[PDB]
């Protein structure tokens, strides 16, 4: 019931990046060997970059960073020694390392048992804190190791002894495993640094990807200058230091890359940009706290929110900047023109005064719901502007910040309370007076560093909306594997991931980026389109015989007009001169898939094609794009002499008057619109939409228009005439195959039934997708019969209708929705008719009865019901649909003829259905056949045709093996046995089993191409062949006897 929104901060302004892989100690030999002009430059460099000065007494392990030092790039008798006694030997002017440490065979491990010998709890996490600062890792068992093949990992004098005191042993072992003395020299502690904070482009993004996938719904970005970055290079040392303010600033260069990037791979999250002038006060009214907030890509969004705090910022720990009114005014009125919403960051009191007085009217007027920050915890300067006087202007006030920063210390839970209470009081009065000023708002709380612990229980109590978390707060994370419970965060990711598991804890949710959108009025444009379809055709039914396609596309009139519009920047983008080989496809694409159209690879493609006979059809993707190139540029009168370059292919050229009209390619863009791919196929996005009430009606509407406008294009053409009536085929043991005519003595003799897909419709090509399919799955249970005389039926659908129209891939799409919208069981086509009646029905009856030529049709026995042999049957695609379809005409006669409600179950209980991609919603509350269902969330076609919510992958263990097997390379090994089945019964007694969890790999360990049929067999595991097995290997038995032993 209680929900938060997790916002995640990777960059910030304030911490910094420590390169892992760079010297974490200089003796001071190497620096006193300098001249001493140079000394005094590099010493004071080091120093401004944390760099400390540090007596004899330290420990290091180092491997792999020596290099040779010539003194005549620059001795000393108190240079000479220390060199030597470092462990260097001189060669007249060339000094080398001939001492050195173990080697990095086997990689440093100091175990979770010789850390807990320390007493000190607190000298184990500075430890801890210590090692992963400077890269090293905790394994799962809670040691600390380090994977690289290089090392340089010294501690303080300071750290030696205390480690001496507490435990003369455990410094034993370091010294046992290659750790040594050291003398005087400097030292990088780290602080406030971290080897995981992205301060690059790509760093960044991948920063936020990360914190998304964990979890977040918003991203807070910040980027770091580059101008004084330079390296020193240290005598003796084959591995510059790095130094560098690495200065928070806007850079417009990094936003040019990151931004268009994210929208890409991540268009639902909520991307919101800093505007701070932190660590350049002298800059506070510049237009560049705002050049950034501009149209990015080709899509042609902007950022969603920007920061904006209505007073000074003023750090007590230094810093800050100004905000004065005519600047704000600037930024609102840039805000708007650009589409921005303001987050309100709440530094101080003074921020909350100002926010609900002057500002109150000027931040309604930017947008509802107003958002807020508030920065707690973090110590605030009120500058008398006549006297320069300095007083707390902090949400928690000093002292009392101080106090419960002790109580966190204690590390009692009584301490804990008292901490959450005194944090709790502070914030509510800001809190209140917020709500009470703005009617709609939303308030997040951001806790720097240690008082993250306070922060769910903080925001528990406020009952606030939001939590943020980030490197920009805090550089560690809460681990309860390791010792001392605290360690370097891994990236913002880490830290939204603990936020999340410890909602979870407590039954609290977290509210996903698209939800989150609709929650504060910034849903996606082509989400937005999707819904003024959806609103445009509210008050028309989904029945095919109540409404024309004119009518339809009459509605959509507007619609139409909006995506002319982006296909008009599409056509532009592609008449811009390139390429010459067939990479036109993969450039075309990239430009389509960028301006949201995606180009879909349909199975009758063919049809538009006037040489289809003589076309090999594997290489079928290539013209597609290129001809669509084609249907766009030649309407505008742009030039397509670059294209038609499919002469240098194997005519493929699509006809002028085959090119699709544009309403038409309308249509095919907003039925794409719902579970899209993002840009490399790594996610789905638009999962949204689906749980519309009016969506299947949507969907159903939009396919009818599309099904008319396309039969029309496909009459015209030399596309392949089909036959009316469903074929009938068996295969028994390559399987041989023959085409029974009128036999139902075929059904009787078969161990499975194989109901039709979408695509396979009775005419050349179907018959042949409709024969491949038949034996993919004969050659899946043969399989399974020589593990721990096959024979299969395969039906394939009518190609004509009564009226003799033909039957295309929108027909089956509209029958799928339309079923979808149908509350009561009473939704048949004409198409399911003649293969219910031929294969049912005569379940239902004494005796043979008359067929029409068109092979349409023209009692009970009760205790002959149980003897009814179990019909075994697989569904592919729309097949879960037709299938329903046929329990349906089933109740129909079944009552006709007369049955107890209970008699029909029996019936029912007679057949069973497993099947592989389910496009159809499986009415659980119906009278029908009990379903094994087994459908992939990266199958965007099954996905975009159903609405149970079981298909969603949300962040959490099934997510984790999705992202694992991402990165993993030979992807023909997957299976997905982490698939975990849900089980549900009906109120008539039908049975389900959900499998959840499953995705299914393509070739490049991607999310494409999730819908083939041999992925969903082949990456099959093991314990569901079993299932089959069951199934196959079974005696007169019913399906919910069956199934329900498969429950234990
Ligand atoms: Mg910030």
Redesign the pocket.
Known sequence: VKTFYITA?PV??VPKFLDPLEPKFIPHALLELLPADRREATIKALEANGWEAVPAGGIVREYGYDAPIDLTDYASATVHDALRNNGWTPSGSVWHRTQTSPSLAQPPLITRNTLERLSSVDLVRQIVLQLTTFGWTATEDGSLTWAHDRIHTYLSPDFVERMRADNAAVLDSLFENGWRMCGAGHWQPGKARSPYLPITANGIVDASREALREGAAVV?L?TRATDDQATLAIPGLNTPIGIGSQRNHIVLDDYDRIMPTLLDLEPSAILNL?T?ARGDRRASQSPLRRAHLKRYGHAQLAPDVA?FSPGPVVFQAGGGYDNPNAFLADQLAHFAEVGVRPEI?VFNHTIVENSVTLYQSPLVKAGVPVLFMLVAAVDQYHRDPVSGDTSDDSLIDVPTRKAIAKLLQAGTDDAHEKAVELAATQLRPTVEKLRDNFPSCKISLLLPGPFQALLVDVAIALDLDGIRVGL?DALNVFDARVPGGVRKACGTGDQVRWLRRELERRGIGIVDAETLRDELGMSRPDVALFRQAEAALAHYPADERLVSADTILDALHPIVDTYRKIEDRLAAHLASAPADPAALAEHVLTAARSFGITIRSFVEELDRYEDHEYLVARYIQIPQALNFARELLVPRGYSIEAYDRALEDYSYSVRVDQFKPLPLRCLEYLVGIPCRYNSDYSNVVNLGLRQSPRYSATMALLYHALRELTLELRDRSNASRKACGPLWTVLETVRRDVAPDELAAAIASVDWVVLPSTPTTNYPLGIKLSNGMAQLFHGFVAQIAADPPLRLLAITHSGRRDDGETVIEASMLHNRFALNADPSGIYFSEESQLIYERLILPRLVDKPAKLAYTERQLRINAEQIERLPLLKCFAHSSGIATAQQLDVQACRDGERLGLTGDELRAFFDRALLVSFGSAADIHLDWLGTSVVDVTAFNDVRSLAGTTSRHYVIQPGEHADVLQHCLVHTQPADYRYDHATPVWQDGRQGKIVARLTGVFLLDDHARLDDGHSIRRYLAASPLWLRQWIARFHDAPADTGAHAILRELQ
Request: aromatic content about 0%; cysteine-free; hydrophobic content about 20%.
């Open positions: 901060a910030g302004a807070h910040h800093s701070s920061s960051e920009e």
